[PDB]
Structures are given as structure tokens and as C-alpha cells.
Amino acid sequence: TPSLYAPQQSADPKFSRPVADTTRTMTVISEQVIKDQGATNLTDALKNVPGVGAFFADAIYMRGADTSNSIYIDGIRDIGSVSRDTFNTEQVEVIKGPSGTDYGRSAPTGSINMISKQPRNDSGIDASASIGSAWFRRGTLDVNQVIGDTTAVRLNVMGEKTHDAGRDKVKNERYGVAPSVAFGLGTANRLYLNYLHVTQHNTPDGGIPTIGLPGYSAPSAGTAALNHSGKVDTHNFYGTDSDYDDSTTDTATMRFEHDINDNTTIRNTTRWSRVKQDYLMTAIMGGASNITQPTSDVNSWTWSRTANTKDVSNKILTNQTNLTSTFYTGSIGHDVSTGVEFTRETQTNYGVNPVTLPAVNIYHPDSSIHPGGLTRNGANANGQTDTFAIYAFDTLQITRDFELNGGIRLDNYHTEYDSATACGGSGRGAITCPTGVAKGSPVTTVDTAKSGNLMNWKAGALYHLTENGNVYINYAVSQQPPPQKANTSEIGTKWQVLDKRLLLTAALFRTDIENEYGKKRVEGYEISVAGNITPAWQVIGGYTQQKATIKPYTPEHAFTLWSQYQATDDISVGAGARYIGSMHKGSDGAVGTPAFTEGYWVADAKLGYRVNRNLDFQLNVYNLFDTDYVASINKSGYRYHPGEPRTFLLTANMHF
Ligand SMILES: C[C@H](CO)OC[C@@H](C)OC[C@@H](C)OC[C@@H](C)OC[C@@H](C)OC[C@H](C)OC[C@@H](C)O
Ligand SMILES: C[C@H](CO)OC[C@@H](C)OC[C@@H](C)OC[C@@H](C)OC[C@@H](C)OC[C@H](C)OC[C@@H](C)O
Ligand SMILES: C[C@H](CO)OC[C@@H](C)OC[C@@H](C)OC[C@@H](C)OC[C@@H](C)OC[C@H](C)OC[C@@H](C)O
Ligand SMILES: C[C@H](CO)OC[C@@H](C)OC[C@@H](C)OC[C@@H](C)OC[C@@H](C)OC[C@H](C)OC[C@@H](C)O
Ligand SMILES: CCCCCCCCO[C@@H]1O[C@H](CO)[C@@H](O)[C@H](O)[C@H]1O
Ligand SMILES: [Cl-]
Ligand SMILES: [Cl-]
Numbered sequence: 001t002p003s004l005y006a007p008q009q010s011a012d013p014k015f016s017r018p019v020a021d022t023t024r025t026m027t028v029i030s031e032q033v034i035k036d037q038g039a040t041n042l043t044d045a046l047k048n049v050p051g052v053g054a055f056f057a058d059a060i061y062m063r064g065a066d067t068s069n070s071i072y073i074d075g076i077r078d079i080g081s082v083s084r085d086t087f088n089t090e091q092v093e094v095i096k097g098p099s100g101t102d103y104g105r106s107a108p109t110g111s112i113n114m115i116s117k118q119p120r121n122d123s124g125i126d127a128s129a130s131i132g133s134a135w136f137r138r139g140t141l142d143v144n145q146v147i148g149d150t151t152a153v154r155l156n157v158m159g160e161k162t163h164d165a166g167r168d169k170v171k172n173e174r175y176g177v178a179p180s181v182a183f184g185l186g187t188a189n190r191l192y193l194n195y196l197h198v199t200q201h202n203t204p205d206g207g208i209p210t211i212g213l214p215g216y217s218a219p220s221a222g223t224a225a226l227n228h229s230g231k232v233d234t235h236n237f238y239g240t241d242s243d244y245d246d247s248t249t250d251t252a253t254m255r256f257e258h259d260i261n262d263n264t265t266i267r268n269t270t271r272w273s274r275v276k277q278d279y280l281m282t283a284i285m286g287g288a289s290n291i292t293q294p295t296s297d298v299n300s301w302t303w304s305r306t307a308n309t310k311d312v313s314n315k316i317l318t319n320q321t322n323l324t325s326t327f328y329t330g331s332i333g334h335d336v337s338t339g340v341e342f343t344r345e346t347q348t349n350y351g352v353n354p355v356t357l358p359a360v361n362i363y364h365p366d367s368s369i370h371p372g373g374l375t376r377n378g379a380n381a382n383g384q385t386d387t388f389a390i391y392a393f394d395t396l397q398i399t400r401d402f403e404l405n406g407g408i409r410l411d412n413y414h415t416e417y418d419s420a421t422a423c424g425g426s427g428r429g430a431i432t433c434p435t436g437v438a439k440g441s442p443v444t445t446v447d448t449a450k451s452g453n454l455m456n457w458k459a460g461a462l463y464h465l466t467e468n469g470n471v472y473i474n475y476a477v478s479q480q481p482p483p484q485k486a487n488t489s490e491i492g493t494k495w496q497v498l499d500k501r502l503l504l505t506a507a508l509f510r511t512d513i514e515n516e517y518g519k520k521r522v523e524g525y526e527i528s529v530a531g532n533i534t535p536a537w538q539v540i541g542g543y544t545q546q547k548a549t550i551k552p553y554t555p556e557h558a559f560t561l562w563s564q565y566q567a568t569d570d571i572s573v574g575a576g577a578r579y580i581g582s583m584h585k586g587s588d589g590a591v592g593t594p595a596f597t598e599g600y601w602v603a604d605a606k607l608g609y610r611v612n613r614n615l616d617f618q619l620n621v622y623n624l625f626d627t628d629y630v631a632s633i634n635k636s637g638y639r640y641h642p643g644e645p646r647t648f649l650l651t652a653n654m655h656f
Helices: 031-036 042-048
Strands: 025-030 053-056 059-062 071-073 089-096 110-116 124-132 136-146 152-163 171-183 189-202 244-261 264-285 302-329 332-349 381-397 402-422 442-464 469-480 484-497 502-514 520-534 537-549 557-566 571-580 600-612 615-622 630-633 639-642 647-655
Touching: 025 031, 025 042, 025 502, 025 520, 031 042, 031 089, 031 557, 042 053, 042 059, 042 089, 042 110, 042 537, 042 557, 053 630
Parallel strands: 071 110
Antiparallel strands: 025 089, 053 059, 089 110, 124 136, 124 647, 136 152, 152 171, 171 189, 189 244, 244 264, 264 302, 302 332, 332 381, 381 402, 402 442, 442 469, 469 484, 484 502, 502 520, 520 537, 537 557, 557 571, 571 600, 600 615, 615 647, 630 639
């Protein structure tokens, strides 16, 4: 049977073949891995993919490219930019390399697809309660109930509140509710209805000065004392008691499926979703012109505070039709996947008055101040993108051993954008009032439309060398809206060994991007392992070696491995280790800021104890050696996020 650590099939019907028979570098992170590791969010889940992390500012990076706009939920773009909890996730599908034929407007470096939980054919209840470091509390509930011969419901509930063990005042609070019903299970006609609501209320973290890090230099001769005063206390909060981050997600999904016959299925999915967010966060600046020296003693010196504010609403409405069909023409088998997608996305950024923040003491920051919140001023920016997309995939079974595949996708989009600024101010990009226009009036500065076409295509071939091993090649030609062109070549090999419960892959890749700014190249090597070495022994991890020629936020070496062993009927033990290579900032870094970050190791451990079939406990320890490191650094180079210290998570799991 399948390993819980190596799901055999993508959930997306655009993938007609099992992962091991797919000519792409594709890692699936199962629900069981997420649970065993205590992963509460997408970023945590992604520790199982080497090199993928939120190294910037915080945004997730893959192969040197921001991936924030290449996150999907059930194959539909995730709108807005909020952290994603794992409570409603069945698995996470990560493609390393292009996926424009599958999603159109995605990063040619990789995509991430979170697969939502659906009603199952069995009845059961799981619940979890957790306590952890820094007042961490979390509760989850997952109820599945079969309600007739062909109907099932599922409900997932989550609540979490925590402070931050490494950071004063930073905190996160959220809850989520995700009810579903499915009709017609086990028949030719199925209807899935999904809803999801999440609310978050957080204190955001702008990070801390980079003084004293490797590569840091004071920005002037007159501030040379900062070459000797040392790293600031990594627990220091440089924001204010007014900083906050609020968001809500509301998503409704309706999926109809009709089997035309045993080998042909048509699907229609409608989703409406809205993500609202507003925040006030403190960004600190440490250039010569940002530093105040009330006396010559550095204990009195300050850096300037900048308010990073946002008040935004994103909406999407999309309808997607997919058709899959398997049939022969002569001796050639066909696996077809084709469809059409209609989408409207909108975004409103609500204008707010400028917020002014007092300077912050470098070594003794005073965050007790209450500058106040945001006030809308009615000068808004509004955007709309309408997209029509059509695609076709086919895998040709030429012989038992040889398969050819290909896909093509066409996107046509229309984008409208308008923006108004309240005139007469001075902060940020202020505007002088036109003649006769009273101060503070919103003045339209942009009002434009645009249209464009994207073509994406890919072709691959795969040869089964043995019953267990194959070799494959894949080629993809991508393009995004500014048209950014990307070509990718890939050759790899995939092996299912140890009763086919363990998947081993290796791939070489080369990607060339033009019109990103000139041409870039990223090439390298990827190895991965997932599944069961023995019935008691589960592993998942990988290794990446890569080089990103320019012509940033990309480790050239990265490793991760998680290993779990069922030591007795009641005792299991797990441990993980990940290496993040050093990274370099070629551009944008201010004078004297670190031009590089050092590589580091992080280790994690787990102990599980089963009391009976209804109750088991789990202890997770994160950053077991309490290692000090730079988790990320912003583009300016003035501020960074320190790696979290050692933390603990203790969970009671109940099953009924
Ligand atoms: C399915 C249906 C369809 O409509 O929706 C029902 C669902 C939407 O209801 C869930 C929601 C109404 O529950 C709100 C509750 C979870 O929040 C409590 C929280 C605000 O207190 C913490 C508080 C600020 O902080 C504590 C301290 C700081 O004072
Ligand atoms: C779990 C519990 C029991 O424990 O049972 C849950 C179940 C009784 O709740 C019902 C829920 C699952 O319904 C989903 C609802 C949100 O459907 C959206 C539909 C209207 O689609 C509109 C479509 C996308 O968009 C329309 C367009 C205008 O945007
Ligand atoms: C107690 C916990 C549980 O481990 O942690 C202890 C930890 C401290 O030591 C873990 C270490 C012993 O694990 C080694 C293993 C995870 O490496 C597998 C990798 C080399 O892939 C080879 C590949 C699958 O091999 C193919 C197969 C045919 O042999
Ligand atoms: C008893 C507890 C709980 O199981 O284990 C404590 C401790 C032994 O765990 C160490 C942890 C770091 O292992 C990570 C694991 C995934 O193994 C990966 C492999 C790289 O380790 C070989 C090894 C560390 O490297 C040797 C050398 C190359 O540095
Ligand atoms: C089952 C795993 C048990 C291993 C426990 C060893 C923890 C090693 O962690 C140790 O913590 C010390 C105090 O924080 C630090 O000073 C050491 O540098 C670090 O090695
Ligand atoms: Cl996240
Ligand atoms: Cl592609």
C-alpha cells in the first residue's frame, strides 16, 4: 500500500499520471508529514523542500524568485498575501521548475499548490490540543461523517494564539472554519461544496538592526562606534504598541463532476474568494542620514522609523472546466486533460493618511508609544484583471516502456487600473493640488487599460528502464506579463524501490529567463526521497545544488531530511535536519549593510506516545541546538529576522 509520506498522485486533474511517472520535479508533502512535524502553516510545511524558504524581508523564495504570486489553493490562485494555516490541507504539491501550462501566470521557477480537505467515505473524528513555548496554544478539530448512501460532510476548525519566543511583543492569533458537503459520492454525478473562513489578528515584526552581523559596517566615518558596539539583543522589538496586522479570508467553492463514461470525466469548478488585510508595521532605517546622535554615546543613538501601512481588499471569481479522457488510437494510448478557465480578479488599495513615527533607540528601543492607527482618506487605487485561458495536455503511451507528453496553454487577459492620491501632502509620493482643487482632494493620477497574450507550452518523454526506474526529459517555454520569456530544460530519473513504498528522484535542470533587466540563468541538481524504508521507518527530504547567473536570496546548497521511526507499538521518534546555504545580496543593499548571510543548520526532534487508539501525545522540539542564525534580511540590508530559538510543542491527539 502507499506510504503516508509519499502520496502517489497529484490531486489536480491536469496531472494525468502518478508523480513517479510525471516528467517534472514535483514534491508532495502529505498531511501525515505535516502532523508528525507539528507544522501549523505553509511556511512550516515547506521546510521539507530544500532551498524553499521565506528568506526575504517575509516572502517565500524558490530558485532566486519570489513565489508569493505562485501559491495556489486547489489549483486556483491564492489572492492577497497572508500566511496560510495547514488545518484544512490534505497535501502540498510543490513543482520545482515551470508550471505555466498548468496555471498560466506563475513563476517559471516553481509553484506551490495547497490541496484542501474534502469529505471522505468514512466517518471519524480527530481533535488536537497543543501548548508550546511563549504561551503557544492551539486547538483543531476534523469531523467527517457519512450521512447517506452517497452523501458526506466534513468540518475542520482551528484556533491559535501565541507570542513569539524569539521576539518581544510579536504575536499571532487566528481561527478558521471550513465546512464541506459532498453529494453523489460513488456515482457518476458528484457535487462538492466547500467554504472557508479565516480571521487573523497579529502583531507584525519588522525585524531588528543588522549592526554587528558578519559583513556589517557603519555607514559613515562619524558613526564608526557601531563597528564596535555589537549585535543588538535579538529579542528587541523596534515597532510601536500601535503596530497591528488584521486579515480575513472568505472562500466558497462549488465543483460539479460528471463521468461521461468510465474513461471520460468533465468537471466544472466555481470559486469566489475575498482576502481583506490592513496593517501598520514599523520598518527601521540605518543610513547615515537616518541616524541621530543626541550625544556621542551610542546608547543614546536612534535609527529612524518608517510606517509600512496597507489597507487592501482582493477578490477573485473564477469558473474552470476540465475534461479528462483516456482512449486509444490504434496501438497508441492517450491520456488527455484539457479545459477552459474564466477569471475576474479585483484589488482595491484604500488610501490612508501618512503615519509619522518617532525615531527608535538602537540598543534600548522604546516600543511603549501609541502613534495610532490608520485613517482612510478616500484616495484609492483600483485594479481589475479579466483572464480567459484554454489548455490541452496529452500523454501518449507509445509502448509499455515509452511515453511522450505535451501541453499548451493560451491566456488572454484584460487589465484595468486607476489610482487617486490625496493632494497637498508631503509624505511618500505626494502630489501638488491642481489649480482650484482643495487640499486633501483625491486626484486621479492613473487611469489605464491593457491587454495581452501569454503562451506556455511543454513537452517531455519518459522511458521505463525497469519495473522500478525510469529516466525522463522535459522542456518548457514560459512567458508572463512584464513579455517575460523563460526556457527550461530538465533531465531526471525516478525510482520506486523497497516494495515501491519509497520514491527516489534525481534531476538536472537549466532555466533561462529573458526580460525579467537582462537575461538570467539558474541551473542545478536536485535529489529527493520520500516514503517508507521499512514498515516502521518513514523519511522525506532532499538536496539541491544550484547556481543563478545574472546578466540573490538563492542558497547554492540546501539540504533537508526528516526521519521517523515507530520504535514500539506505543513509541515513535522523529528527527530532522536542514541546511540553508549562505546567500548574497548583489543589489539594493545600502552602504555598509551585509552583502551576504551565512549558511546554517537547524535540527528538530519529535517523540510520540500512544496511550490507546483514542489518545496519543506528541512532543516536538524545534531548533534543538538553540542555534543563532539569520533567518532573513530585507533588501536594504538594515534589518533582519533572527532565527527562532529552541521551542517546544506538546500536543494531545484524540481520535473517535
Ligand atoms: C459558519 C458560520 C456561518 O456564519 O459562521 C460562524 C463563525 C463565523 O463563527 C465563528 C466566529 C463568530 O467566532 C468568533 C470567535 C472565534 O472569536 C473570538 C475572539 C474574537 O476573541 C478573542 C479576543 C479578541 O481576544 C481575547 C483578548 C485579547 O480579549
Ligand atoms: C461541516 C458541516 C457539518 O458538520 O456541514 C457543512 C455544510 C452543511 O455547509 C454547507 C457549506 C459546505 O456550503 C458551502 C457554500 C459556501 O457553498 C458555496 C456555493 C453557494 O458556491 C457559490 C459559488 C462558489 O460562487 C457563487 C458566485 C456568485 O460567486
Ligand atoms: C531516531 C530518528 C529516526 O531516524 O533519527 C535518528 C537520526 C539522528 O539519524 C537518522 C539517520 C540514521 O537517518 C538516515 C536516513 C534518514 O537517510 C536516508 C537517506 C540516506 O536516503 C537513502 C535512501 C532512502 O536509501 C535507499 C534505500 C534502498 O537504502
Ligand atoms: C535521540 C534523538 C532523537 O531521535 O536524536 C538526537 C540526535 C542524534 O539527532 C540528531 C539530528 C541532527 O539528526 C537529524 C537526522 C535527520 O539525521 C540526519 C543526518 C544528517 O544525521 C547524521 C548526523 C547528524 O551527522 C553526522 C555528521 C555528518 O555530522
Ligand atoms: C533527544 C534529544 C536530546 C538532545 C539534547 C541536547 C540539546 C543540545 O543543545 C544544547 O543546548 C545547550 C543549552 O541550550 C546549548 O548551550 C548547547 O550549545 C546545545 O548544544
Ligand atoms: Cl505560511
Ligand atoms: Cl509548464
